[PDB]
Amino acid sequence: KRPDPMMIRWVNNKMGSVVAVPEELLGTHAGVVFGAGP
Amino acid sequence: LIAAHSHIRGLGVDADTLEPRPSSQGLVGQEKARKAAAVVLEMIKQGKIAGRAVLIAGPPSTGKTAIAMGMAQSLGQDVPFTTLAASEIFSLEMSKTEALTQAFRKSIGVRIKEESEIMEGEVVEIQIDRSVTGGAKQGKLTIKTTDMEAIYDMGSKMIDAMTKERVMAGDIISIDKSSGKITKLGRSYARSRDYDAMGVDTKFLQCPEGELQKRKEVVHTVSLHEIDVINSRTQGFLALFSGDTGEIRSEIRDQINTKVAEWKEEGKAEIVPGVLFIDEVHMLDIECFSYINRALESDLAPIVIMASNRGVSRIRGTDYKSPHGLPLDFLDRVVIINTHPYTPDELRQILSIRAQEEEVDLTPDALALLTKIGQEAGLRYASNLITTSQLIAAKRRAKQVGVEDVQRSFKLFYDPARSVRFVQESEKRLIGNDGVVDFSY
Amino acid sequence: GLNLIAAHSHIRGLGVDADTLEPRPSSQGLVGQEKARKAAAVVLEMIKQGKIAGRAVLIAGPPSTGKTAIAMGMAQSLGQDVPFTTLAASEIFSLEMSKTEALTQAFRKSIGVRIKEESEIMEGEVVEIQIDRSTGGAKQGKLTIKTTDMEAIYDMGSKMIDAMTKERVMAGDIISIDKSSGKITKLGRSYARSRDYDAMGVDTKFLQCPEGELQKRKEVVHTVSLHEIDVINSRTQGFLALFSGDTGEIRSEIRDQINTKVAEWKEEGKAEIVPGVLFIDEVHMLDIECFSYINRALESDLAPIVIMASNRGVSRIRGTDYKSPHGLPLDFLDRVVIINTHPYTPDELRQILSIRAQEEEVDLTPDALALLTKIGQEAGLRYASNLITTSQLIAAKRRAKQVGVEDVQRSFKLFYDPARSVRFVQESEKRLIGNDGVVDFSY
Amino acid sequence: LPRLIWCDGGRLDKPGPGNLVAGFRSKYLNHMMNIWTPENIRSSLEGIENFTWLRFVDTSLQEAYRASHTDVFARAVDLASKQNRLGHMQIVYDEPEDKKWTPVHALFQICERENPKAVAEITTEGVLRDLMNIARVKYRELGLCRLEKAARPRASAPPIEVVCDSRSAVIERENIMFHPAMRKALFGPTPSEIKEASFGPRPVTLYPPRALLPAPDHDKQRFTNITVPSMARFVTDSG
Amino acid sequence: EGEVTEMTPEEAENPLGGYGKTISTLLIGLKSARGQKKLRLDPSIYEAIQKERVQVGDVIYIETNTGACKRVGRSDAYATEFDLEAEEYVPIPKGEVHKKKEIVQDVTLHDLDVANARPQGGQDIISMMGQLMKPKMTEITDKLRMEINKVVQKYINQGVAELIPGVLFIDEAHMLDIECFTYLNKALESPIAPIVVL
Amino acid sequence: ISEVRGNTRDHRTAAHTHIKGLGLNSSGIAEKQAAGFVGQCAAREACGVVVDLIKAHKMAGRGVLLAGGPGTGKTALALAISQELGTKIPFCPITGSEIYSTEVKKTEVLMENFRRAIGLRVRETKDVYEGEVTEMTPEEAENPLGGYGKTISTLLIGLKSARGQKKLRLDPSIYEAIQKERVQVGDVIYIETNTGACKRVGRSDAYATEFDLEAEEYVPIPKGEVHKKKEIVQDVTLHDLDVANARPQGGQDIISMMGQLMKPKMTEITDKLRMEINKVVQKYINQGVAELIPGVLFIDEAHMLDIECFTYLNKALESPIAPIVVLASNRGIATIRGADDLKAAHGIPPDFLQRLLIIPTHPYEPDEIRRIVRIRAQTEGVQLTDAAVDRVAEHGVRISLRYCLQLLAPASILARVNGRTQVDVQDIAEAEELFLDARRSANILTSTGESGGLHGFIS
Amino acid sequence: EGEVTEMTPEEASTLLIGLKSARGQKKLRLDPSIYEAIQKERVQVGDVIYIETNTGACKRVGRSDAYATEFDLEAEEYVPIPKGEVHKKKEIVQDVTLHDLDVANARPQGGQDIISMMGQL
């Protein structure tokens, strides 16, 4: 299985929260906020 | 706040015999009118009769509004009770006829029954996927009771609601699947500490128990007018509240009348006929009355209660005078209830009730003087002096309203009869009907 | 058909000799009114010649003397070739626009611009279509089409393939193509292919194959009124306002441009101007502001002829508190000629009732016709004409083949005429609501 | 309609051979002798002259010129690409030392720089927020979004069309009656635009930022008069 | 009709329109109990599907008369409790994907007048915005009424329609005015006027 | 940017600028000359009870009538009531002329003003973080998700205000707002805790020199704390709630946006909305988070209302949430504006007149006029000789109070253009001859307009 | 006025358009904005077009009938090539009024105001 190239995932549970980003979006402008721009 | 009819809390009649008590539920006297009104309440509560027009007539004061307001208080919440000042029918947005049609149809309720499913549980997990630079959204909710846990798919509308509501793990939430409303109720454990800006701390709750889903019957009452508005439009249902409806086409109302009959026989709806109270009806014109003649003839007509102060008076839009200000072919359709001027023993009781409602402690001498003033100057004026005397008594730090305070109130504030004398005594310094006046000393 | 029998359905024209304008005593559905029908015949000559602009004619006479009948006669004898505008004066009182705007629009509807345009048009039965979609569609395609006289293949351009696939053209369809624009209209389905049409219910009609050349230069004649050109130019889809009617008060500089543009087309020969006629029924319902407008709207070269009808005596002009003949100000009546219509004699009443009975489906005995004629003299032509329908329905209910005196007498007894109904209100006065609003409900 | 009227200069606004007025009048009345063009505005921008206020209404000479020439639909799309920043200043520039700061070029935008709504969005208990939402909350609580339609139009039609045997008329029908830019505004970005906006090295704006068609008031009926039978009817329509 | 099995847009790269790209067609797969089709839809029919919020696995209805689309529900193949929103789970449509239905309709001439005065049936932009603007009566012209007489006359000549002329009852007719009565003198001459009872 | 004007910031003066209050003792008895009033002692004492009625918040929909000739101080008394109450209490003044809108039925206009006169005060806490963004920094998660290139557990933002610096350890979901708002380092933002999102105010003017040209405005750094939590008090009329519900403002769609670009006509709002507003307002009052502030609707020239307005006010005044309504009239015995054959006192329908507390205002004695002249002179800043005070007061007695008061400003100018700071009889005698009163002007109309053919008045 | 012979870009947006008549050819350097006007008209090579080069108006007159047999059927309006000079210079005296200026400055007019087709407001 591989995640959707265009969708960023937020998830929250007992441990708190994470956001996970497709490697297709790292190296785009969307990656910049995660420290992983062009 | 206290208002003119706040003490009126019913019609004051025996529910068995319909006998009016001489004082009850804030109403005093008027026993024939109160008994007639009690019979009209039975016609309303039974609902079988359509379009009976009742006119409460009498001189000013004498409780025509008070009795009509007593009826509203006796019907309770489920039944429609539309009140019109007859001056509201004149409009720029719509014709007078349309304004009357809307007010008639506001007075008929439609009690829809729905069955709905609500979820309720502790949120164990929430997951949301968002597109970059676009509207596409999807997600999953993991939700729990002491006895179930399940994972639900979420659509875009749910994801908007979930974030608007800031749903977080450990929250207790309930979701009406029919309306799509989400509400939070508390938390199963403390708000987690690592993150800043996480918002106000909730109520505590223990986890919900039993099944996640449950079914719930829910009942909604809407007017025929509200159905008219919803069905005349694809878009713009804000007209329910804004006015702004235009003149709704009659073939829409034909369809709604048919479908509501179908909904009733189908058992989807119970029709609930209420009343239109038209206040000071002599403000309607001859075209309004000609419309109402036949609006009354529908089997969806409400019972129409009316009030008039008028004697033999000119009909509006008309050359000629008629009793009550109303035309005769209209009055042929109308039964009249008559209210009468009060006895001093009735005025004393009404003033005592007003004083209690306004929380004012009259001395017996102040009440006697106010009763005498009530005979000479009118019930409304004497009721105004109660509030005035209370203020004056308080400024002199008295415990109770004395004759001193009523006399000073009477001195400061003129009654209508004394004001008319003041006007007659100063006809040159007041402006005349022909506009002449003298400003010089 | 759709068109039912109405009050004027028997009128087919003016009943006048085309050579001399002499009216015949009865023809084309009009009886009598000979002096008035001759005058209306002279007005038709003025209209059809188009030379004179802005004449106003008043038809003046008592009620039910054929003022509308003569107006229908003129409309029917001009036919569809000329703009005829039928205005009730009550219509000028719009909430959408001012009275003078509504009068301008009525005048502008009554002048036509006549324009002649050719198109090549291709019409035939489809023998075959093939289309290649590769897969985005419409890459290429071929049409085979025939008449009873001719057959051809056409290579199709991709936008014609879009037209063909939009209108779901299939073998056996009889189609016309306006090849100057490429709209295709499915005139029908050929009978020779009836079994190919498996999705068509038994109610489906079928045509024979078209005839002659597959391609013809058809010539179309259009007439568009000045009002249509005005409304077209008022907003981005202004022509829709010719139907919904929500034209505002269209600005006069638009009209002045259009007047210049049409005079240009006339001198270039691109178009012809066809002056029509405006009919204003019950012209006395216009007010003093309307009349002072009409005074000068008649002075234009783009004024129609105007024809007006009034029942009124010396009567109050609307919007003022004084009285004038026909209900019309003398200021206006100076620019008008009057045609006067008279009451009918009994033999004219007999003839009109006969024509009305033959236009209706009514077999009428001679004594019933005599009785209805006497009722006509005493109760008026309209009441007697209304009794024809009634007596037929009574005769039919008793299963009778003819309307007899018995049936007319039931009708006369059941339905009062105006004079009997006036007597009824005078005898019933206390039980009716009087002008003072008083009434007594008691026995 | 004949093409003489509908195509060949019987329409006053459309230039061509046989309509020599329209091209002149279009240029001179909308640009040369037009008060809202930036060269004309810039002459009147001072003193008590008629554009003196423009300095303070938060709009450029270019924006004033666009708003005077585009229609209220096109302007409403342009208004989608804009931010309520003067309302955000009400949240931030708040203390007495902030002196109710406002950009001086936005000085006259008083009623949006201060109004209660923006504050009610931000307070932790939404009392004034809920008070401003009563009408739509009540509407949904009554279920009028979900109750079946009790009426619909008995007949329905598409718009009337001009029939003219010219290709230009057919092109114009597509340009106006199926207007691409209005449709694109209503329904929003295409799938490749969402990809091209999302995978690029730098952000990029979209012609509308979103689909601008409103949400339907009725949750099940939406924008059509089609109705579908249901088990409730099926049980009850046989006695 | 069918369950939507696949749904795929195809795009136009408009160079200089300024609105950016547009969608040139949609390809959609509809499956019924009896058979299956793939439809290459016109953009204006895809806009109807966009308004209806259709997704793969929905059951939909497409009236080609209007180009309107109705979402009937989710396919029963997906029937599950575990969605927060109250979906209509519906079975796969029976019969062929493509159907023709015969319906008998009762309309008045006024319903036709109004339908063509304020159009709402197409998927064009005028029809679209006409569903969003406030309802409003308008002074419908005699041109529209005479045009609709010709439309109805063709339905009659085609045999698909029959005329049912009825009656107008004007109660309280004394409340009319001289302009109304003058107008009835024109209106009652109309060759398809009703019977009028005062 | 803007050039501040430094020299002067003094007030203008209008007909009632001297009225500062009702001028009453703590016992409520009127002082014979106080707060700018002279006389009217009974009417001021009655208005003093009216002030106490309003300020007590017990009662709804009581009516008051100020009755008396023109110039007898009725609007002075109304303005004094508004000042005794102070600006926290709503005060909605209209003339009866203002009710005849072209957009809506006049009873809607009356009901709008009726609910403008009712205030609501709501107390809430505002809770936001603010600053220029000093830093943005992800934290990787210790349990990264499979198949994803990065997993972020926290998103740190540094916020700086003029008064501090703070590291906000935010929930990772704020990436959504940062992308959509396009937040950079050096942009000024706030984060609101009721959503956890952020909004961008602009770029900090600390960066205004980053480029020779950039297309954005620059905004100052917030001069508050970096974390702003405080209570805020919001005052709205119930009419503001009507409009906020009937004409929602924030809509993102094309129809909302076309709406806010077009003429925003008022609409005939329903009693169903107003009743539903009242019922929810009363919920929050019972919870104690809001408090109702019943104000005053003052209707000047109330004889301009017609009988349809008055019969509506019957219903309006009977509703439980209603202002105090004050009417003023001077029209003697007069025809009701909408009922051309009913004449009544004050021009008020007798049916309605029974509701009102009536306060009469009487004429002024010569010495009261003279006292008002001096109060008016010292308010307009005019300095007079005592002979000039007498001559002005003589016009106040012989002609009208208003006329004599109006001569003070002309006479002040005529004095200073003779180099005199103090106005004297010579100046009054010129002002009164340049500026006629009504009656002397009417005598000219009677004398010169004796004929109209030429050089005569049009009549 | 001529048959379009060429539509070549010459800028990073400026075209050269070639126009033909029975009496010769001419090439025009196009301003980027009149090019978009020509592009909003559905102009292609082989079409006949009219241009007011001073006012910036242009019209597609049709497709030249030298292309009439591109296909045997296409939904297209084939017109003869212009028989005159491809370029014409005319002196026109144009009248307006101050009210035409009022109207033009008060509201977007004509093809600017497309939403006006909805009527009502």
Ligand SMILES: Nc1ncnc2c1ncn2[C@@H]1O[C@H](COP(=O)(O)OP(=O)(O)O)[C@@H](O)[C@H]1O
């Ligand atoms: N019989 C009664 N019992 C109690 N209160 C009364 C009675 N009659 C009148 N009132 C009160 O006195 C006032 C005047 O009566 P109202 O009903 O307004 O008279 P009207 O018939 O003119 O409407 C109201 O505040 C009402 O509550």
Ligand SMILES: Nc1ncnc2c1ncn2[C@@H]1O[C@H](COP(=O)(O)OP(=O)(O)O)[C@@H](O)[C@H]1O
């Ligand atoms: N000379 C005539 N010949 C034939 N029919 C006539 C004649 N005069 C009147 N009628 C018919 O009698 C009826 C009444 O006359 P009409 O012209 O309608 O009245 P008015 O003159 O008041 O308009 C109409 O149905 C009309 O067709």
Ligand SMILES: Nc1ncnc2c1ncn2[C@@H]1O[C@H](COP(=O)(O)OP(=O)(O)O)[C@@H](O)[C@H]1O
């Ligand atoms: N008692 C008073 N003391 C001081 N000034 C007064 C007094 N009464 C009236 N005035 C002033 O004289 C003028 C007339 O009073 P005003 O309130 O306008 O009369 P009204 O409202 O009755 O027409 C106003 O300029 C007012 O300020």
